Amino acid sequence: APSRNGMILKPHFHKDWQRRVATWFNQPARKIRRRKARQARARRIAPRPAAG
Amino acid sequence: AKSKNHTTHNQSRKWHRNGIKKPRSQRYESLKGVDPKFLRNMRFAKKHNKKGLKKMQANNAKAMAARAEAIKALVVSRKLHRLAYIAHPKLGRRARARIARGLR
Amino acid sequence: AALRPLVKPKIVKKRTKKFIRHQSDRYVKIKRNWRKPRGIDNRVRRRFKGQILMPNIGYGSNKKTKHMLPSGFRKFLVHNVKELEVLLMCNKSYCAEIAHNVSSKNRKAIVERAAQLAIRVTNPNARL
Amino acid sequence: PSRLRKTRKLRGHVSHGHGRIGKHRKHPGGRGNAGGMHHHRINFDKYHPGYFGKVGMRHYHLKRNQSFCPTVNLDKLWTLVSEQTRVNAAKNKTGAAPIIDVVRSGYYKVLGKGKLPKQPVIVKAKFFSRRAEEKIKGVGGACVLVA
Amino acid sequence: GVDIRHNKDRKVRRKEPKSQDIYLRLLVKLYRFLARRTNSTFNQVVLKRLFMSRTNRPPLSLSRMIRKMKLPGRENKTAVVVGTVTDDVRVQEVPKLKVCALRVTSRARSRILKAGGKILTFDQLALDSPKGRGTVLLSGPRKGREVYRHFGKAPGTPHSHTKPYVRSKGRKFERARGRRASRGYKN
RNA sequence: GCCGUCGCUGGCAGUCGGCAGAGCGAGAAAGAGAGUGGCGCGGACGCUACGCCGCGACGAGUAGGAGGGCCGCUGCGGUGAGCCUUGAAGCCUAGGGCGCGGGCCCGGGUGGAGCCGCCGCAGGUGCAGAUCUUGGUGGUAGUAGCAAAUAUUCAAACGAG
RNA sequence: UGGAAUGCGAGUGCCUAGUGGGCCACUUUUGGUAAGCAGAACUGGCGCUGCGGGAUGAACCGAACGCCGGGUUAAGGCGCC
Ligand SMILES: [Mg+2]
Ligand SMILES: [Mg+2]
Ligand SMILES: [Mg+2]
Ligand SMILES: [Mg+2]
Ligand SMILES: [Mg+2]
Ligand SMILES: [Mg+2]
Ligand SMILES: [Mg+2]
Ligand SMILES: [Mg+2]
Ligand SMILES: [Mg+2]
Ligand SMILES: [Mg+2]
Ligand SMILES: [Mg+2]
Numbered sequence A: 001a002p003s004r005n006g007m008i009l010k011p012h013f014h015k016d017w018q019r020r021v022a023t024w025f026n027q028p029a030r031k032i033r034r035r036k037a038r039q040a041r042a043r044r045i046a047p048r049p050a051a052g
Numbered sequence B: 001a002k003s004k005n006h007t008t009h010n011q012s013r014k015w016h017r018n019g020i021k022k023p024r025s026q027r028y029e030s031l032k033g034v035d036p037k038f039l040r041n042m043r044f045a046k047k048h049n050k051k052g053l054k055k056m057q058a059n060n061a062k063a064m065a066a067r068a069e070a071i072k073a074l075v076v077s078r079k080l081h082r083l084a085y086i087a088h089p090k091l092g093r094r095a096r097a098r099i100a101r102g103l104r
Numbered sequence C: 001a002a003l004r005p006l007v008k009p010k011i012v013k014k015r016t017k018k019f020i021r022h023q024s025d026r027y028v029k030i031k032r033n034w035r036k037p038r039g040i041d042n043r044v045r046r047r048f049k050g051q052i053l054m055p056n057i058g059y060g061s062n063k064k065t066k067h068m069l070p071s072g073f074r075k076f077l078v079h080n081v082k083e084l085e086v087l088l089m090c091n092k093s094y095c096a097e098i099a100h101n102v103s104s105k106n107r108k109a110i111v112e113r114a115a116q117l118a119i120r121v122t123n124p125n126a127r128l
Numbered sequence D: 001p002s003r004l005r006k007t008r009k010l011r012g013h014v015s016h017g018h019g020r021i022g023k024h025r026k027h028p029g030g031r032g033n034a035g036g037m038h039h040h041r042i043n044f045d046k047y048h049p050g051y052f053g054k055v056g057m058r059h060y061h062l063k064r065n066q067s068f069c070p071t072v073n074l075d076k077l078w079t080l081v082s083e084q085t086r087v088n089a090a091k092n093k094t095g096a097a098p099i100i101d102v103v104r105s106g107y108y109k110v111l112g113k114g115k116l117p118k119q120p121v122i123v124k125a126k127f128f129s130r131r132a133e134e135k136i137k138g139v140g141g142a143c144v145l146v147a
Numbered sequence E: 001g002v003d004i005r006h007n008k009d010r011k012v013r014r015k016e017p018k019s020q021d022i023y024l025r026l027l028v029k030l031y032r033f034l035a036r037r038t039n040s041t042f043n044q045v046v047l048k049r050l051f052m053s054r055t056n057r058p059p060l061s062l063s064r065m066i067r068k069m070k071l072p073g074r075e076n077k078t079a080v081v082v083g084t085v086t087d088d089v090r091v092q093e094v095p096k097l098k099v100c101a102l103r104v105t106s107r108a109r110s111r112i113l114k115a116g117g118k119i120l121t122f123d124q125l126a127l128d129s130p131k132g133r134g135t136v137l138l139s140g141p142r143k144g145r146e147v148y149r150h151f152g153k154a155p156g157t158p159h160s161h162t163k164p165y166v167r168s169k170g171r172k173f174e175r176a177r178g179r180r181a182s183r184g185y186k187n
Numbered sequence F: 001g002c003c004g005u006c007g008c009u010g011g012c013a014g015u016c017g018g019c020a021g022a023g024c025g026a027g028a029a030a031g032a033g034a035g036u037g038g039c040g041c042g043g044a045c046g047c048u049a050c051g052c053c054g055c056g057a058c059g060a061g062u063a064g065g066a067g068g069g070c071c072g073c074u075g076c077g078g079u080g081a082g083c084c085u086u087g088a089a090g091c092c093u094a095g096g097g098c099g100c101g102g103g104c105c106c107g108g109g110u111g112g113a114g115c116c117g118c119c120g121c122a123g124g125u126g127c128a129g130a131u132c133u134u135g136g137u138g139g140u141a142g143u144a145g146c147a148a149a150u151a152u153u154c155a156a157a158c159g160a161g
Numbered sequence G: 001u002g003g004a005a006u007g008c009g010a011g012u013g014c015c016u017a018g019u020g021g022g023c024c025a026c027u028u029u030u031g032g033u034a035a036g037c038a039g040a041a042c043u044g045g046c047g048c049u050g051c052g053g054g055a056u057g058a059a060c061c062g063a064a065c066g067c068c069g070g071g072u073u074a075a076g077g078c079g080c081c
């Protein structure tokens, strides 16, 4: 129930949103994985520019 | 089931906890709700106030001159009284010396 | 022949009985540790006459004799000789209590040192 | 941290601070914004006038890029250039006026709030406001339209 | 029994800064002594404001300080603000000021100093003006906050120009019924 | 008399010492002012200023709000040159005490390998109830009872019986 | 000559829980034969509140409450309990 002044809010949590929460604890691992693949690609194609 | 319908019991007790405060009074009230025709002219009266600015200065200085000129022409018991005089820290400063000097 | 405090005023206790919890005499599951009764009908809470008494700040002890031991000192727990030397300059008002978990070997050093420094020990004859 | 919150102070107090009469029940009054036109009407009309009904035209497939038009007032115009630009032009004798290109600073329309320093300037912009154009002209400046 | 109410016994007011900053409290120690041991009410007012919260210590813009320090009779006085002196790009020429503040923004320092002015700290003001003589105490706008737009009569009451709380602003967001006569009513 | 709260948005940085001089409570604004002419080597405490000190008033409380906890539980970062097989945690105790209290300390016993103080951080953090959950134990109580369908007796053997 | 007495420091803003079953007494008062009935006004109470008296008692009378010593009282009492 509304209480005094406030904002009217419509949160989109009327589904089973907990079934589909994407956490980001693998983020540092992803950053290491992508960096390890950039270095391994730069070595493979050297002396061609790494950027592409 | 049935219940109570209406009452004002306990209501004047609640009203007076923070006091039945009278409305706040300011020396300038809002012109809201006054006659539109009269308000239109009052705005016009204010709008041209500055037209007679120089005339007002002359009269005010002239009035001040006359006002200043007129000015420049124009300009319980005798024992307890005495004791109350001596006991005064300033007024009785010399009197207290007199009794002390005589005492010596 | 024990060390004496700088002063020994009279200690006044507004109360000496402990405050026992309501109904703690009727059940074993209710310990005697005080709990503020909060029942709607609780006759202890409403301060009926002849009922269990509730603690309140009025029973507070005089600031001048609060925490003061019967000997007139105030205790200070110590665990070793280094902790004991803080009481060097307040040895007429604060005594030393050796913590229970200090081995008998270490007590002798503390008890001996306190004698040199004129610090009083509340439990000098323990674990001998 | 949960050690600084009421729950730690409501231990041993029956009702946990929700009252003995009304209690804490699940959803008295409805869930979310239920009751707007009903038992919750006073709140909505008192604090959210206009909440109910429809006003104006619909626009399908709005693209907010098309209306992109950042604006800048005249009181901030000279901040788009370096400090030494304004002092050098203030103290030059040829009368050469510096060019201020608002689009380079990320603005498209120039607005007229404020006053300009008494100093000629050439302003470029996609759009100008009337009072902005007069104020820029009042100090001997010129308005230049870009696309 | 005595017939008296006790709901107003305890006055609500700060006796010290909620802030744990040790430099703020060193100034509070300094001005606690000055407020106590001098008959100056300027010392008392400054002491009070060191306790005040962030929203009771609004920042003073450079333009506003110049405007208030340009009034007649205020030449060669020290502007004193218990707060932050922000910069105002809308100003063109900065005169020579002498200011005392808790903070001065990086760009406001260069502008004040470049014009020949002086920036004091409240410990330097005490040595310069122990009683607060020759000062001009200044405050930032207190109602200069987005919150005060939302206070007053509720937006849905006659002649209530209060700002409502809307998640988004647009034609579809609290403009239909109660805000025009065409939809129900207006007030 | 003592405890606490509130108020005086009260007082104390002046411990200004032999590079000294002891005051600022007093009915009644503003200077214990500055100048120019007419033997001994001494003098308590204090002040964690988040501290210390003074004076006056006051103190009921459900629902509810707030503050303060050197109240208590578990784990993390720091710290205690911390405690501990010369005995940790735990547990018991007609032992000695502390605190208004939440609780805590010490003595004695048992135990056998870990544990706690302080500054911060964190929480699956405090039970008398919920016909609460699971486990255990009572009184009832040596009680109800061991009563449907006719029935057993004598002698001997084995055997501790 | 701050223009009656008396007393008293005031103003102002945010955020806000619980509550939204009440009930009782003097006086006034509607319905009803009346009700420890139903319904109102005013104030005060109980609810939320102990304490002395009414033997006993939500509301009556006195009086409101920090922990104590002395003194004196209120309403009530002083054959014995
Ligand atoms: Mg609510
Ligand atoms: Mg009702
Ligand atoms: Mg009750
Ligand atoms: Mg409560
Ligand atoms: Mg409940
Ligand atoms: Mg609540
Ligand atoms: Mg409710
Ligand atoms: Mg209800
Ligand atoms: Mg809820
Ligand atoms: Mg009282
Ligand atoms: Mg009260």
Ligand SMILES: [Mg+2]
Binding pocket: E007, E008
């Ligand atoms: Mg209050």
Ligand SMILES: [Mg+2]
Binding pocket: none
């Ligand atoms: Mg109270």
Ligand SMILES: [Mg+2]
Binding pocket: none
């Ligand atoms: Mg026992």
Ligand SMILES: [Mg+2]
Binding pocket: none
């Ligand atoms: Mg083992």
Ligand SMILES: [Mg+2]
Binding pocket: F124
């Ligand atoms: Mg856990």
Ligand SMILES: [Mg+2]
Binding pocket: none
């Ligand atoms: Mg249990």
Ligand SMILES: [Mg+2]
Binding pocket: none
């Ligand atoms: Mg039988």
Ligand SMILES: [Mg+2]
Binding pocket: none
């Ligand atoms: Mg059978």
Ligand SMILES: [Mg+2]
Binding pocket: none
């Ligand atoms: Mg009735």
Ligand SMILES: [Mg+2]
Binding pocket: D021
């Ligand atoms: Mg109730």
Ligand SMILES: [Mg+2]
Binding pocket: none
């Ligand atoms: Mg009440």
Ligand SMILES: [Mg+2]
Binding pocket: G049
């Ligand atoms: Mg009562």
Ligand SMILES: [Mg+2]
Binding pocket: G054
């Ligand atoms: Mg009777």
Ligand SMILES: [Mg+2]
Binding pocket: none
């Ligand atoms: Mg008495």
